[PDB]
Nucleic acid binder design. Structure first.
Length: 93
DNA sequence: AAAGCCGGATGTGAG
DNA sequence: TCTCACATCCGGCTT
């Protein structure tokens, strides 16, 4: 968690700690489908994790959208705040 | 309406 | 350096 520096890694570690389920949680752990339960809250954690000021979900969602073309994380269509990891942490590296 | 999601255009700071 | 990995902003589309 603390050693993490990329957004996909930080999101993955929060999804591994049950103390953060009210921010972000698995909906299908095997398929690596997760839901962002608190968009504004998760953005606050991401900004604090990067020692940054004024991090918002609008800006953080843009970073997730860059993962679309890179085949790292894809958004489940038609659903709200439902995303899917396309690669394991090893496949991304 | 108004908020959620999209990708373009550019900035930025670390490596 | 350029590249990388977002960060910042925004108009257009969608819900």
């Amino acid at each position: 968690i603390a050693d993490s520096r990329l957004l996909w890694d930080y999101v993955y570690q929060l999804l591994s700690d049950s103390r953060y389920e009210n921010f972000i949680r698995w909906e299908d752990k095997e398929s690596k489908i997760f839901r962002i339960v608190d968009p504004n809250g998760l953005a606050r954690l991401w900004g604090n994790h990067k020692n940054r000021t004024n991090m918002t979900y609008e800006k953080m969602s843009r970073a997730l959208r860059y993962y679309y073309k890179l085949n790292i994380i894809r958004k489940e269509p038609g659903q709200r705040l439902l995303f899917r990891f396309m690669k394991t942490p090893d496949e991304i590296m």
